[PDB]
Every structure is written in C-alpha cells, then in structure tokens.
Symmetry: none
Subunit: 147 residues, 4 copies
C-alpha cells in the first residue's frame, strides 16, 4: 500500500532497472484512494499524503526496490494542440476556452496549448480560426491550468 | 432618430466643437435600442444598423450640427488592473477569469489586462498572487475580449 | 463490432447464464464510438445505431448469443448523496449546482439526489447546510437529469 | 447620503402621506452606491450600510420628512411564469436554468417559479414541455435564488 512518491524516473535513472508502469488515463491522475493492477499483472494500492495537487504525472515512482520500480504512465489521448501567433491571441483563446469550461494545458513551447479533443472545441477554434492540429498524445497533469 | 457613426473624436478634434455626450455605463453599450437625455439636457433616441458588434466605443460620434457635438461618454468604473509577469501568467489569468464568466479587456501594454471589480475576482487574483491595482477607469468597448 | 442493445437483465434472465460484464465508469456510458476490453480477454468495439439518450445502464445486454452474455457493469465511485427537506430546498441545490455545471442524478425517493463527490460541491453543501453523506455508490444513467452542455447546446 | 432603510411601507402606514416614487428596473436594485432622478423632479444622495444582500426591495423607504416620503418603485418587465407539475420536474428545471447561469425566482403557487424573459430560456422551457406563460410583472429580489 503506497503512501508517498519516491520522485520521478525523469530525474535519472538511466533504466537500467526493471519497470512496471501503472497505466492511467489523463482524467484519472487525481484519484487518491485507489487500487490498481499494474502493467505486469502486479497489485498496488495508493493512499497518499500531500498528493501532488495538479495530479500524478509521467514517470512518478510509486515503488522502488533495489532495481525494481513502478512508475506512473499516462496513456495517450486525442488532443488539440494550439498555436497562438501573438500574446494577445493567447489571452483570447484562453478566456474563450475558459468560458467554455474545457481543460487546458501548456505546450512543449511558448505559444502552445493542448486541450482534449471535443468536436465543439474544434468548432470554436475554427470560428476564431486558430492554428491547431489533433494528435494522439500526452497531457501530463503537471502541464495543467488550475481548475 | 439618430443612426450613423461618423466615428470618434480620437481624430483630434482639439475642439473647435462644444461637446455634449450621452453617458452609458460600460455594459449599457449594447442596447440595440433605447432612449436617453444627454449631459446638457438635450433629446434624441436610437436605432441600430451595423453598430460595431463589440459595443459602443469611447467618443462614438453620434450627432453633428456645425460645431455642437452630441456623442457617447463611457463612465468610469471600479476596475481591476492586472500586470502579468510572463506569457504563462497571462494564460492562467485568462482561462481562470474567462471561466469565472467575468469580463476582460486588453490593457495598455502587451501584458496588461482590465476586468470589472468584484470581490470573488479580486480574491481569486490574490489566491494566484498576481500583482494588480484597483483603479477607477474607463473601459473601451473596443478593447473587450469577445466570447462566442 | 456492436450495433445496438438487446434489452437489459432487469428483463430476467435469471442467469442461469455467463455474463461477461464490460466495466463502465459513470461518465463513460454515453460514448458511441469506443473500444473495450470485457472483464476477461474479449475485445469489443461499439458503434451505436440509436443510442439511448441518457446513456447505457446497469447490465444492459450489449451482446446476447446463446447462453453467452455480455452486459454493462457500471463501476462505483464516491457519490455525494443528498436528502433535502422541502420543494424550496430542492429547488436551491439544483439551481446552485446547475450553475456549478455539475453532474446530478435523481436518488431513491422524491427528495433525495446524487452527485459525484468533488470538494467545492461539498464545501458549499455545508456552507448552506443540506443533509448529505458521501458514499461509495453506483451512479445509474437511467437516473441522470439531462445535461447540458454548459450554457448553449 | 442615505443609509437607512427607514423601513418598508407595507407596515401600515396607509398614506397618510405624500409619497414621491423613484423607479428602477429589477437589475438596478443591486448597488450599495450610485445616483438618480425622481418621479417629480429631484435627485438621490446615498450609500448602503446593510445593503440587504438581495438589494433594494419594493418601497424600501429611502427618505422621510413629515408626510413627505420617497421610496422605491420597481418596474414591471416581461417574466416567464413557470408551473412545474411535480418535484421531479422542479429539479430538472432549476438545474437546467442554473446551467444557463440565467436568473430565477421563487413563485407564489407551489411549483411556480419565475425567471426573466429571454428568447433562449424560453426555447429551453419548451424543449422540456414545461408549461409556462409570459407576463409583464414585478420581481422581488426578496425572491431570487442565490448562487454561492
Ligand atoms: Ni459556466
């Protein structure tokens, strides 16, 4: 029964280790009491203090033992990436989506923002006519914009 | 009844023209119709074709008889003035506010933003710890952020 | 690839059968295109000719060939239950929550109601003080309460 | 400057008095502070200590000198009068209106509620086959449901 995180694979870790991942959808990282069957059949429960608020993230270690580990993996989803030309054009998108109540994440870079696919968020984005694309990928809860 | 934009005395206009405007509070800027009595107690009503979708801007030139101008003044209001420290910070603000369903205006510099004062909001802005000042101020219908 | 329902188990079916439930979370019952894994091996896609409007329900028969059945189990989750004293009160909750854009479901009797636990939704429910216990419980689609989308459909 | 809700009229008091009325719409009762022109000529100096949440109700007695009084008349407005046939349906309605962040008031009959008139809100009410009827009427902020 897991209680606290031993950090992240990201912070090396050249692996090197055996890793059992725990495969979680994006909408599932804030779960607090939970039971899980791991990637390799294994069992693992979670009951956390100072649960990372924003959510659990890519490669979060639930369990390290010698060279054995369990990390969180975060399953890829359908996703609208967004490219604002300008700092104004950012504010505009963001308020807009806010107003919509959609979810919203930072991109890999400056004027990039990903939010889940939804046919009407598309809609919006075309209306105001912005640079988007749908790409199966990864919305780390670390990237989110507070509820 | 009055009908046409002839613009906005931003195109100075160091007057040259004795001025008499109507006073709308900032949201009353999108009546498709209504009547009021101007600031020097004169009369005229409204009708609306093609009046810019965002609302009436500051100094929207209504009437003209020689030099004697009838137009629009937007009263100043209590206003939260936000200074973002980074493009990230902006986005947060906007999403967060736009979600609140509150209303937003672009500011003076790239990173400045203006919304009506409320407590819920001010509050919020401090539970995110952005720097801002509460000021009394005009809100051009033109620097509003749209919604759709 | 599955097309439409074959009724429910409420229509017994005193099983007497081998149900292989597919396991839905509360908000998953309304997709019409999605790929599943039954409780045991089987792969299962759904493409739904005339989906029920409010969603899939408890043990709706997704697949009925011979004895071999595959029905919908709906997972449990933390529900704020709500028992509320009068028609006035009801009317508040509901309004206050619709504004919150939260999910909301008719409970067992005329006065009770269920909603997904979040913290805000609860925090207020005390802040205005209606009777409510939080319970691991099932949220039946059949018993929703339209939707929304928030603001304009 | 007025503070005092000197009281409210319906505590008879059956005039008894000359009473000058000042006429606001429902949307205008909200403020602690701002200014005005009365039925017969005049103009109001005020702020509000205990601005009863809700706001300025009907004939909340503002100023009072002899049989010389002013107080709040509130104008009629189109209103949607709703008759929910059961609590099942009370809930579906309330919720679905709150979901529009629209406005809503307790009724008079038992499964009656009232909300401003808006062409989409209407649109709503018929989709559900809830039965209503649009009437010009009063709106007591003593009757608006809250949102916290
Ligand atoms: Ni909303």
């Amino acid at each position: 029964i897991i209680e606290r995180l031993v950090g992240n694979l990201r912070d090396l870790n050249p692996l090197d280790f055996s890793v059992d991942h725990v495969d979680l959808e994006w909408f599932e990282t804030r779960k607090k009491i939970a039971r899980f069957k791991t990637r390799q059949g294994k069992d693992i429960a979670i009951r956390l203090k100072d649960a990372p608020k924003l959510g659990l993230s890519q490669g979060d270690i639930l369990f390290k033992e010698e060279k054995e580990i369990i990390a969180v993996n975060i399953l890829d989803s359908e996703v609208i990436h967004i490219q604002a030309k300008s700092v104004a054009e950012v504010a505009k998108i963001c308020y807009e989506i806010g107003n919509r109540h959609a979810a919203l994440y930072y991109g890999e870079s400056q004027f990039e923002f990903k939010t889940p696919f939804e046919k009407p968020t598309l809609a919006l984005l075309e209306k105001l006519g912005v640079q988007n694309r749908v790409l199966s990928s990864k919305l780390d809860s670390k990237e989110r914009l507070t509820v």
